[PDB]
Amino acid sequence: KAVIKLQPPWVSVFQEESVTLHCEVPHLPGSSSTQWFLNGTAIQTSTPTYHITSASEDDSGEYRCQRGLSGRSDPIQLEVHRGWLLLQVSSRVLTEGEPLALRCHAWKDKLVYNVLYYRNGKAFKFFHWNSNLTILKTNMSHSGTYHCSGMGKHRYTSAGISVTVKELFPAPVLTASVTSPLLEGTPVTLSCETKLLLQLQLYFSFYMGSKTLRGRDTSSEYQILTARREDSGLYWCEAATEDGNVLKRSPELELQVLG
Amino acid sequence: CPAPELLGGPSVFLFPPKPKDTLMISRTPEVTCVVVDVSHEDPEVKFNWYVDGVEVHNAKTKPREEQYNSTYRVVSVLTVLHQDWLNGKEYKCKVSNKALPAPIEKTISKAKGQPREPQVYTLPPSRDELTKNQVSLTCLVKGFYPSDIAVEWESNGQPENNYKTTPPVLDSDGSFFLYSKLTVDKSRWQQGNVFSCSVMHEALHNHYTQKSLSLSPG
Amino acid sequence: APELLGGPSVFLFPPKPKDTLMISRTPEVTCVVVDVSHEDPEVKFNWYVDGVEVHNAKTKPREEQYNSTYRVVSVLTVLHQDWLNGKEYKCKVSNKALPAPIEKTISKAKGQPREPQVYTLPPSRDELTKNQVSLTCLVKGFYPSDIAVEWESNGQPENNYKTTPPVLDSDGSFFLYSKLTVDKSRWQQGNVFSCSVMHEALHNHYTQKSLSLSPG
Numbered sequence: 058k059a060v061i062k063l064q065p066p067w068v069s070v071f072q073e074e075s076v077t078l079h080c081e082v083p084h085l086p087g088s089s090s091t092q093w094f095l096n097g098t099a100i101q102t103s104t105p106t107y108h109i110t111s112a113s114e115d116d117s118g119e120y121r122c123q124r125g126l127s128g129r130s131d132p133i134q135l136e137v138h139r140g141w142l143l144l145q146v147s148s149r150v151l152t153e154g155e156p157l158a159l160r161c162h163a164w165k166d167k168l169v170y171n172v173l174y175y176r177n178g179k180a181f182k183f184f185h186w187n188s189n190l191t192i193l194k195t196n197m198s199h200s201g202t203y204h205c206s207g208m209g210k211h212r213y214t215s216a217g218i219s220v221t222v223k224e225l226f227p228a229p230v231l232t233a234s235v236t237s238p239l240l241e242g243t244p245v246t247l248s249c250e251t252k253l254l255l256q257l258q259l260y261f262s263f264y265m266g267s268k269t270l271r272g273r274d275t276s277s278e279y280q281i282l283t284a285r286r287e288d289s290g291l292y293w294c295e296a297a298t299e300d301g302n303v304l305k306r307s308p309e310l311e312l313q314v315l316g
Numbered sequence: 317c318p319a320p321e322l323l324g325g326p327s328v329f330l331f332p333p334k335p336k337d338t339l340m341i342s343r344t345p346e347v348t349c350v351v352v353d354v355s356h357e358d359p360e361v362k363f364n365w366y367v368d369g370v371e372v373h374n375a376k377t378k379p380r381e382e383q384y385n386s387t388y389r390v391v392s393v394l395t396v397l398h399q400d401w402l403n404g405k406e407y408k409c410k411v412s413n414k415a416l417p418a419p420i421e422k423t424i425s426k427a428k429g430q431p432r433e434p435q436v437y438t439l440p441p442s443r444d445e446l447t448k449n450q451v452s453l454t455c456l457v458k459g460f461y462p463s464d465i466a467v468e469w470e471s472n473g474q475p476e477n478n479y480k481t482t483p484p485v486l487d488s489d490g491s492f493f494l495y496s497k498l499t500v501d502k503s504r505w506q507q508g509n510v511f512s513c514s515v516m517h518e519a520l521h522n523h524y525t526q527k528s529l530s531l532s533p534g
Numbered sequence: 535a536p537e538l539l540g541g542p543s544v545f546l547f548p549p550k551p552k553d554t555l556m557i558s559r560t561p562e563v564t565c566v567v568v569d570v571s572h573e574d575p576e577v578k579f580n581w582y583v584d585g586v587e588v589h590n591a592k593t594k595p596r597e598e599q600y601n602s603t604y605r606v607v608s609v610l611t612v613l614h615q616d617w618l619n620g621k622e623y624k625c626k627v628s629n630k631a632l633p634a635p636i637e638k639t640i641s642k643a644k645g646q647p648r649e650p651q652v653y654t655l656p657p658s659r660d661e662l663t664k665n666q667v668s669l670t671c672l673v674k675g676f677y678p679s680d681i682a683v684e685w686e687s688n689g690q691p692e693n694n695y696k697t698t699p700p701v702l703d704s705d706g707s708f709f710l711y712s713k714l715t716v717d718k719s720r721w722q723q724g725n726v727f728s729c730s731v732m733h734e735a736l737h738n739h740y741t742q743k744s745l746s747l748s749p750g
């Protein structure tokens with residue numbers, strides 16, 4: 058199960074820049090074997106690191122590798138461009154939550170000011186001095202075509218790149234069998250609808266007002282022996298990734314208890 | 317050349333009032349200090365409005381407009397006294413923002429040079445034109461300075477709907493001249509309608525003059 | 535004004551009208567290249583004419599600017615009638631400091647050429663009180679805006695006339711005025727002056743009109 062990684066993470070590069078491609082599997086003493094495929098075609102190179110001393114137009118295309126394993130690596134599309142400016146991306150296709158690095162790279166590393174970054178046509182960030190853009194956590198809203206503009210001698214533009222953000226599961230719903238306000242003493246079961254697994258274990262949490270219901274090592278529910286008038290309010294549960302990498306807090310669901 | 321060069325920051329453009337604003341007392345002339353490249357991070361803008369060096373207040377502010385490119389645009393309008401402007405009083409705009417190392421002193425003031433009163437001469441159509449369905453009425457304006465000006469054509473107490481006026485042109489004497497061409501149906505002329513060319517300029521008595529036209533044997 | 539770090543810029547210029555207008559003249563298209571570094575002075579020209587590469591382009595000598603850029607000029611000789619038929623001329627610029635070549639296209643404004651109507655107008659009576667008087671030549675109904683106007687007298691050109699820029703008329707056409715200025719003395723003895731005009735849409739690309747006023 059190989060996987061391709063790029064030294065310059067950048068999937069789109071200028072002519073004459075250096076880029077080395079490594080196929081790496083986490084084995085300490087792993088044999089030096091590699092099977093590179095291009096446009097469905099194996100290259101003669103077997104070393105796990107694809108070094109490009111001087112890139113070319115012909116160096117462009119989709120890259121895949123196989124090293125000492127059953128199956129083959131994911132296909133990675135590499136594009137070499139010509140022009141003045143280049144919006145550089147760490148990835149073309151990713152699921153939300155994975156971080157995304159962007160770079161508006163200038164020719165010959167020339168200095169550019171009043172740099173603009175675009176998402177789906179809308180400028181969302183301006184930089185007086187050229188800077189990297191890192192989204193610590195991505196979502197489907199980050200999906201779309203990116204552009205960049207900056208001021209050198211004149212307002213130059215970069216080419217657009219399509220970025221694909223895959224959503225894992227849409228936000229869950231906590232549903233109650235009854236409408237609020239409610240009567241005192243009732244035992245209530247609250248269910249957080251999801252009903253779908255992306256293709257693991259879930260930690261759930263319940264809160265009350267600006268304060269907090271117990272946080273310790275929570276499971277999915279609680280039983281209210283006696284629902285009381287003081288219990289009228291907004292109830293919610295929480296969904297997050299194993300990593301905590303992707304986490305969703307939930308919207309307030311009001312429950313009013315009368316008694 | 318108020319172009320003291322520095323490095324990469326928000327930019328300011330300072331715009332003079334509209335001439336008609338300068339010309340009709342029943343109108344309100346404005347000076348305009350325009351600020352671009354304001355970040356969302358630093359959207360706070362300070363205006364100082366030194367007039368000849370005397371800081372004034374009572375500058376206003378139209379609402380900021382988010383630009384498509386996601387910068388902010390801010391406009392400041394300083395109301396101006398008619399006589400203040402024509403005497404060439406200086407209007408200085410100072411712009412403060414935390415992201416600027418040093419303050420900006422955009423400067424403006426009325427164009428310099430000897431104001432010169434226009435001569436106005438009205439000219440009837442060439443006889444050769446009298447053969448057409450439409451005829452050309454000519455208003456010649458020359459000798460004026462500065463080139464800043466407003467011109468209108470009128471008939472029967474109403475502006476005519478079909479005249480054209482040239483941009484100012486630099487004359488050989490350092491002054492400017494221009495032409496405004498009014499077009500009218502032949503019938504109306506030969507029916508002896510009276511047409512008027514109206515001109516507004518600093519250097520005319522009451523900033524205004526008109527010339528009339530009808531046959532004149534002698 | 536020389537901003538942060540980019541490179542040379544390109545401008546593509548039409549011929550002078552009289553060259554297009556006078557057979558004793560040679561009309562030229564001019565491809566001008568500025569902001570050339572001393573470091574990267576090599577310029578490549580391609581000249582697709584209507585798409586047809588030509589070689590009969592004439593490359594002018596580089597001239598040093600104070601800012602150490604060189605105005606580079608390419609002059610393509612043109613047959614008068616080629617331009618007027620509205621053929622497209624393309625200048626392509628290749629250079630190592632340029633990631634990609636630069637393309638410029640030009641050609642005559644499109645639309646039905648229309649003949650200017652011309653009427654000459656004497657000074658206003660009101661001016662006759664002054665030391666100087668104004669002489670006007672009106673040109674209207676003409677298209678495209680490319681044009682040349684001169685003033686002459688007794689077989690000689692006048693040394694003192696001014697002409698306005700083209701103006702958009704309401705009918706989509708242009709008009710202008712040209713002002714020739716002459717001493718009153720010259721005027722009242724009744725010398726005859728002519729405004730001369732050269733245009734595609736004139737017979738011989740030419741017409742002139744005269745103006746004379748004196749006790750008939």
Ligand SMILES: *[C@@H]1O[C@H](CO[C@H]2O[C@@H](C)[C@@H](O)[C@@H](O)[C@@H]2O)[C@@H](O[C@@H]2O[C@H](CO)[C@@H](O[C@@H]3O[C@H](CO[C@H]4O[C@H](CO)[C@@H](O)[C@H](O)[C@@H]4O[C@@H]4O[C@H](CO)[C@@H](O)[C@H](O)[C@H]4NC(C)=O)[C@@H](O)[C@H](O[C@H]4O[C@H](CO)[C@@H](O)[C@H](O)[C@@H]4O[C@@H]4O[C@H](CO)[C@@H](O)[C@H](O)[C@H]4NC(C)=O)[C@@H]3O)[C@H](O)[C@H]2NC(C)=O)[C@H](O)[C@H]1NC(C)=O
Pocket residue numbers: 171317318319327329331348350352353383384385387391
């Ligand atoms: C983000 O978006 C903002 C909006 O831009 C919009 O532009 C187009 C693309 C539009 O389709 C939209 O999609 C865009 O969103 C950008 O703001 C623009 O940014 C530039 C500079 O950054 C501004 O350029 C300045 O504009 C003045 C005014 O010229 C008129 O042109 C338009 C017609 O209205 C209008 O856009 C202008 O506002 C302006 O008209 C005036 O508008 C105001 C509105 O309040 C009215 O009140 C006025 O009545 C109206 N006046 C009219 C009409 O006459 C322009 O004149 C300036 O030119 C200078 O700037 C150049 C520098 O690049 C320079 O080369 C020029 O020479 C000139 O600067 C000086 O010129 C003199 C002449 O000799 C020289 O002596 C000097 O040496 C020279 N240099 C100096 C003094 O430093 C000026 O370019 C543009 O106006 C502005 N948009 C609007 C609207 O104003 C924004 O730029 C963009 N991002 C970034 C990073 O820029």
Ligand SMILES: *[C@@H]1O[C@H](CO[C@H]2O[C@@H](C)[C@@H](O)[C@@H](O)[C@@H]2O)[C@@H](O[C@@H]2O[C@H](CO)[C@@H](O[C@@H]3O[C@H](CO[C@H]4O[C@H](CO)[C@@H](O)[C@H](O)[C@@H]4O[C@@H]4O[C@H](CO)[C@@H](O)[C@H](O)[C@H]4NC(C)=O)[C@@H](O)[C@H](O[C@H]4O[C@H](CO)[C@@H](O)[C@H](O)[C@@H]4O[C@@H]4O[C@H](CO)[C@@H](O)[C@H](O)[C@H]4NC(C)=O)[C@@H]3O)[C@H](O)[C@H]2NC(C)=O)[C@H](O)[C@H]1NC(C)=O
Pocket residue numbers: 535536537543545547568569599600601603605
């Ligand atoms: C290094 O120095 C150069 C400056 O030269 C030196 O001059 C003096 C000041 C000296 O002391 C030094 O200090 C200076 O170094 C810089 O070169 C300049 O760069 C700018 C742009 O980069 C050029 O701007 C262009 O110029 C045309 C005007 O062209 C006519 O006028 C000039 C007279 O020579 C010259 O440019 C041309 O020759 C041409 O003149 C004709 O040409 C022949 C050739 O000899 C002559 O024999 C003829 O007699 C002569 N006839 C007439 C008439 O001129 C200017 O019009 C262009 O500006 C338009 O295009 C701009 C592109 O961005 C655009 O921004 C503007 O809108 C502008 O307006 C255009 O006008 C039409 C009219 O309708 C509109 O329709 C268009 O839409 C519009 N164009 C556009 C794109 O919108 C053009 O920019 C400038 O010419 C050049 N200076 C020259 C040449 O002398 C050099 O840049 C500098 N280095 C750096 C890094 O800056």
